[PDB]
Enzyme design. Sequence first.
Site, PDB file in Angstrom:
ATOM      1  N   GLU A  35     -24.904 -35.477  10.700  1.00  0.00           N
ATOM      2  CA  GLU A  35     -24.335 -34.178  10.446  1.00  0.00           C
ATOM      3  C   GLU A  35     -23.009 -33.955  11.139  1.00  0.00           C
ATOM      4  O   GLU A  35     -22.114 -33.388  10.529  1.00  0.00           O
ATOM      5  CB  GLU A  35     -25.280 -33.040  10.861  1.00  0.00           C
ATOM      6  CG  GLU A  35     -26.558 -32.819  10.032  1.00  0.00           C
ATOM      7  CD  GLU A  35     -26.331 -32.312   8.637  1.00  0.00           C
ATOM      8  OE1 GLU A  35     -25.294 -31.865   8.284  1.00  0.00           O
ATOM      9  OE2 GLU A  35     -27.291 -32.549   7.855  1.00  0.00           O
ATOM     10  N   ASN A  46     -18.176 -24.543   3.076  1.00  0.00           N
ATOM     11  CA  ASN A  46     -18.723 -24.884   1.750  1.00  0.00           C
ATOM     12  C   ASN A  46     -17.984 -23.921   0.775  1.00  0.00           C
ATOM     13  O   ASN A  46     -18.464 -22.793   0.636  1.00  0.00           O
ATOM     14  CB  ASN A  46     -20.232 -24.703   1.720  1.00  0.00           C
ATOM     15  CG  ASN A  46     -20.866 -25.573   2.827  1.00  0.00           C
ATOM     16  OD1 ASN A  46     -20.879 -26.807   2.675  1.00  0.00           O
ATOM     17  ND2 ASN A  46     -21.281 -24.930   3.902  1.00  0.00           N
ATOM     18  N   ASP A  49     -20.151 -21.915  -2.080  1.00  0.00           N
ATOM     19  CA  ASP A  49     -21.003 -20.737  -1.833  1.00  0.00           C
ATOM     20  C   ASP A  49     -20.512 -19.821  -0.725  1.00  0.00           C
ATOM     21  O   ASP A  49     -21.196 -18.813  -0.421  1.00  0.00           O
ATOM     22  CB  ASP A  49     -22.441 -21.181  -1.648  1.00  0.00           C
ATOM     23  CG  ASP A  49     -22.748 -21.640  -0.218  1.00  0.00           C
ATOM     24  OD1 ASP A  49     -21.918 -22.084   0.541  1.00  0.00           O
ATOM     25  OD2 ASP A  49     -23.928 -21.567   0.149  1.00  0.00           O
ATOM     26  N   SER A  51     -20.189 -20.356   2.457  1.00  0.00           N
ATOM     27  CA  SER A  51     -20.959 -20.365   3.745  1.00  0.00           C
ATOM     28  C   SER A  51     -20.275 -21.454   4.600  1.00  0.00           C
ATOM     29  O   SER A  51     -19.498 -22.236   4.070  1.00  0.00           O
ATOM     30  CB  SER A  51     -22.433 -20.608   3.558  1.00  0.00           C
ATOM     31  OG  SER A  51     -22.675 -21.949   3.051  1.00  0.00           O
ATOM     32  N   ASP A  53     -21.202 -24.338   7.911  1.00  0.00           N
ATOM     33  CA  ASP A  53     -22.218 -25.054   8.714  1.00  0.00           C
ATOM     34  C   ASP A  53     -21.534 -25.248  10.113  1.00  0.00           C
ATOM     35  O   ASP A  53     -20.395 -25.653  10.208  1.00  0.00           O
ATOM     36  CB  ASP A  53     -22.640 -26.416   8.162  1.00  0.00           C
ATOM     37  CG  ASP A  53     -23.073 -26.343   6.707  1.00  0.00           C
ATOM     38  OD1 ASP A  53     -23.937 -25.550   6.430  1.00  0.00           O
ATOM     39  OD2 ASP A  53     -22.546 -27.126   5.894  1.00  0.00           O
ATOM     40  N   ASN A  60     -26.446 -23.557   8.911  1.00  0.00           N
ATOM     41  CA  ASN A  60     -25.712 -22.686   7.933  1.00  0.00           C
ATOM     42  C   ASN A  60     -25.785 -21.209   8.187  1.00  0.00           C
ATOM     43  O   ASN A  60     -26.833 -20.659   8.517  1.00  0.00           O
ATOM     44  CB  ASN A  60     -26.077 -23.249   6.566  1.00  0.00           C
ATOM     45  CG  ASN A  60     -25.346 -22.584   5.384  1.00  0.00           C
ATOM     46  OD1 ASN A  60     -25.931 -21.584   4.925  1.00  0.00           O
ATOM     47  ND2 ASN A  60     -24.219 -23.113   4.944  1.00  0.00           N
TER      48      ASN A  60
END
Length: 130
Positions: A35, A46, A49, A51, A53, A60
């Site tokens: 990750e 992202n 959408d 959002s 992370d 998220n």
Amino acid sequence: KVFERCELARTLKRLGMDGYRGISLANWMCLAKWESGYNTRATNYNAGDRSTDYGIFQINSRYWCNDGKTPGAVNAAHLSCSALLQDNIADAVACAKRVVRDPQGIRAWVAWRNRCQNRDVRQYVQGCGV
Ligand SMILES: N[C@@H](CCC(=O)N[C@@H](CS)C(=O)NCC(=O)O)C(=O)O
């Protein structure tokens, strides 16, 4: 902060992640590696959408932490996303344990499935003394 492999492993051990909800330390190590490369300042927007992370585990902002700019994150979290960018990972760990309390468990991270599931992850903890 960018952790060294064994430095992280001992740190997660101490924060009680080994076997948390049936998940071994090697599995959490595998997850942090794919990750964020063990980097607590890692952020991934992202565009699809809207959002973001955050941090070492790439948690998220739509359901887990609040950053204010994510749509449909319609309150709920109470932890500020900023908490996941600290050098101290205590909050990030408290949060990752929250995530796996849900039915999906570690499967909630698609990177875990692509890169760690049904694989020999012993390599991530080899020689760390944990
Ligand atoms: N949206 C879910 C999860 C939100 C949530 O629990 N986020 C955690 C972070 S992973 C949190 O805010 N903990 C902050 C705290 O309780 O200090 C819920 O409300 O049950």
